Write a protein that binds this ligand. Structure first.
Ligand SMILES: *[C@@H]1O[C@H](CO)[C@@H](O[C@@H]2O[C@H](CO)[C@@H](O)[C@H](O)[C@H]2NC(C)=O)[C@H](O)[C@H]1NC(C)=O
Ligand SMILES: CC(=O)N[C@@H]1[C@@H](O)[C@H](O)[C@@H](CO)O[C@H]1O
Ligand SMILES: *[C@@H]1O[C@H](CO)[C@@H](O)[C@H](O)[C@H]1NC(C)=O
Ligand SMILES: *[C@@H]1O[C@H](CO)[C@@H](O)[C@H](O)[C@H]1NC(C)=O
Ligand SMILES: *[C@@H]1O[C@H](CO)[C@@H](O)[C@H](O)[C@H]1NC(C)=O
Lengths: 357, 369, 371
């Protein structure tokens, strides 16, 4: 476990719900007798693609007693309110972020009926929401779907004579072949590696295979994960989080993983390629500049990503780093409120509780 | 400490308050010089007995209306009448409706209390001074911290019974150091003493289990005969469960993850907690070591306890175990070791009920009902 | 780290806010080749000095309509009628002053600036334009100290006698009158109330000028590089555990006597001592010493030995998590935990209710629910 990790080539931020935060996958396999290879021109996935499984949406509830709304007017209602004249009819409650896999494009969320939904002839452009009379709609009719998900990059396919022991990234990251498998995405053939990255290079598929690891390291990963899950348990309870606690969601080993922040009291997600950091100067060459992708990362409203913030005098507070310095800071400790809980998440079975709005 | 641990002989559930959660005693002692012996036949304690510490009950509060509101000290007789009306759907609701005056007995339940199984002394924060004793001046009821609110057990008999033994067969091992369960789990004489229960002759072992045979200071643990590293881990584990308990009592919610911290990590007698009807539930069981998940999970959807797949309640089992939507058995410790996160195991499950007369300081605000 | 730790020469209690809880400094430096030296007779700091950071105060709000800006002593007169009884409560039911207290503020004891969220933009300085009060983030509410002199004083010194230790003619450390070695590592020279002396790394000052102290002190208000790795990351475990304790207090406005004991200094030396009275948190200051055997401090189940005398406590609460049960047994959280003896009274989350309305405030007004 390096002292620290910092994302390389960070993707754009997507707003998410609290329930979307996931504890990092901290597995990383070493390089042994596998160092030489041939440079392989291959395309891999752009960082936005890994934020394609979060589809923005709103919900719609009709009334005079509640009635079953239909998509067309729900949209023009949702298009108003985005600027406001009538304010009522169809009650529009947002954000309603859902997950969806790239393959069947199935949607998954507690606000959707039976936990999930699939666009069908009977619902071509909406989901039912296990409410009496509320239907869920995405914010882009096309659900931010696209296949412009690849870019050119140069790596080295690693020799072991004839056989392939692994891969090495354009960044330099050794990614092994231990948990690699072959899979087409968007009509291109490529390899799917344990780490999460997909690469286009062809030779010869949530879970985790953990049989070839020393007890000591599999115990440490379980330690790490449980720590993070307690924090998640408490974030979900209190709808709040401290920048300290948020740092437990930072992928602790080099590799692809999520990067988390808070903007406008909403949790935000992006994808990056994590690189080991050995010296605080390597990412803070002076106290006021967090170096990410060769640029000072400015942040927003004093908040960078992954629990990093900026104090009252402009200095960067990296939780892990302050903690190793025994220098406590109330700003790292204060609970940041994430108020929004969507009404129809915990809903069951003349006018609902969301008569409030 | 075994990988996991599963109850044998799982007794019936009784409802408890969150405060009755009790972090397990994880002490278990070795067999290093006690080979074989003669199979003896004996009486041990039915699990239900170990739940005689808890006595279900309710509370009753006199209610005088207005005219054009007030408090009186009712008697058990028609508190019990109004309580029974509340159990079936008699218009006891009409009672709590609003010169002209109305008398009503406001029933508030559950009010589970703790009881000295011998003193028969009940303990609660609802009882006046946190305890109560039946007397000729209160034959069948108790006083609370509210002068106009009485406490009454649901069973006039407070489940006091002596039908608490029954027949079991095991092995007395020769050296004589201890006895082997009908479950085959060694118990040592280490930390044992003598005592009489329902007039009977028997020994109590460190486990607390009682067996009928003979070949006397008697709750406590001494833990001297324990190496440093182990007692550190016992403390480590216990403090970890106490953290869970503190947050449970505060938040009045509990996640199945954390619920698993109350299971006895070692074989022997201990409690088994589950959640039925939005209420904590307690039963007693004899715990058995587990070395391979497939011994309890003959397939993904069957949890093996007392020979049968446990059906579980509301797709939820005990000790933090649940069923997913398809029936898959989620055992927290198991999932955790596979690095497989489940929100079902993380959602804080609400145990909302909090009795008004707990920590009440001498018409009342608790009264709009 | 000693099994436990007990405050010697315990000063008085100052009511603090929850946010004023601080996680201890568990550093301590051993002796190597620093055995004996010359006895000395010095001045050291009264423990109350270390709570001079906390200036009590109240806020006075002018009601007539709160639409009236109150004069400073239209407010003290109102506040002193709250302290006792009087018509105060009858103005609240033409000109009247709603008093809202406590309103503790931190103060830098040299430039005398006060800081708190009830103050305008979170801080305050006296000026000829407010020689005896402060502004709030509400235009009709001022803030006023409880003492005109904000606890300022130079009567902060006490006479005690130490041992000045020698390796060579180089001085390596002191031995306070309690007996506890305090090294010279990270010591500096400073002037308090016009006396000059050395500030040792433990938060203590003694008047006694020694050689090789050519550098003066920067901020009274830690750093640490020459310590065993194992030790430094042990300390980080303790700090982090205390910081978690604190994150939940601030959120929930409550704390258990289990949790509270995580704030006690794990090593001998100057440290804060915390308790609750009257549903308010409370800080004091003492010179902690190692406890090696519980009976040293618990000679008998009902008496906790602090400064020769049994500590009475207040409402069954003595400090640092120590409480008295229904019998009057002394429950030291650490001691109960090592015996695996659970007690609900330790787990119980004790409420710290008070939230002064004017914290981050931004006709008539809403918190004016007549009090
Ligand atoms: C007194 O000294 C303190 C330094 O401890 C100064 O504190 C700063 O005050 C500004 C506003 O006045 C705050 O925004 C800063 O956060 C404070 N810094 C610290 C370190 O507390 C204070 O300004 C000084 N006052 C005077 C009059 O010199
Ligand atoms: C009023 C009511 O709901 N009663 C039921 C009871 O019949 C049942 O035995 C128990 C199981 O725990 O659950 C409850
Ligand atoms: C946050 O809110 C402000 C105010 O409405 C808005 O202008 C801003 O664009 C929002 N944040 C981002 C990242 O756009
Ligand atoms: C029963 O025992 C408890 C302590 O174990 C005591 O508080 C209670 O008063 C006793 N009552 C009687 C009647 O012995
Ligand atoms: C606590 O409150 C009482 C008044 O009820 C008062 O007499 C006592 O001095 C207070 N003690 C402290 C330490 O504040």
């Amino acid at each position: 476990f390096p002292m620290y990790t910092i994302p390389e080539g960070l993707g754009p931020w997507t707003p998410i719900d609290l329930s979307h935060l996931k504890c990092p996958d901290n597995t990383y396999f070493a390089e042994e007798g596998c160092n030489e290879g041939s440079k392989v021109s291959y395309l891999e996935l752009k960082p936005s693609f890994h934020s394609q499984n979060k589809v923005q949406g709103f919900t719609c509830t009709g009334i005079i007693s509640h009635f079953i709304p239909n998509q067309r007017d729900c949209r023009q209602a949702r298009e108003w309110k985005k600027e406001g004249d009538p304010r009522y009819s169809w009650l529009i409650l947002d954000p309603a972020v859902v997950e969806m896999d790239i393959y069947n494009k199935t949607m998954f969320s507690p606000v959707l009926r039976n936990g999930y939904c699939n666009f069908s002839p009977e619902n071509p452009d909406f989901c039912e929401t296990n409410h009496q009379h509320s239907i869920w709609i995405p914010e882009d009719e096309g659900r931010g779907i696209t296949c412009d998900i690849f870019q050119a990059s140069t790596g080295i396919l690693l020799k072991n004579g004839s056989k392939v022991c692994g891969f090495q990234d354009e960044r330099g990251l050794f990614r092994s072949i231990k948990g690699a498998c072959k899979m087409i995405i968007c009509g291109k053939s490529g390899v799917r590696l344990y780490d999460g990255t997909w690469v286009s290079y062809n030779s010869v598929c949530h879970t985790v295979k953990l049989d070839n690891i020393e007890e000591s390291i599999v115990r440490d990963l379980i330690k790490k994960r449980e720590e993070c899950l307690d924090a998640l348990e408490e974030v979900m309870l209190t709808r709040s989080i401290s920048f300290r606690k948020l740092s437990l969601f930072r992928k602790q080993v080099p590799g692809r993983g999520y990067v988390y922040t808070m903007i406008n009291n909403t949790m935000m997600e992006a994808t990056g390629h994590y690189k080991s950091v050995d010296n605080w100067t390597d990412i803070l060459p002076n106290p006021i500049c967090l170096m990410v992708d060769g640029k000072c990362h400015p942040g927003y409203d004093g908040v960078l990503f992954n629990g990093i913030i900026r104090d009252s005098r402009g200095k960067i507070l990296i939780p892990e780093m302050q903690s190793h310095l025994l220098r406590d800071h109330l700003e790292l400790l204060k609970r940041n409120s994430i108020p929004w809980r969507h009404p129809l998440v915990h809903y069951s079975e003349d006018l609902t509780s969301f008569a409030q709005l």
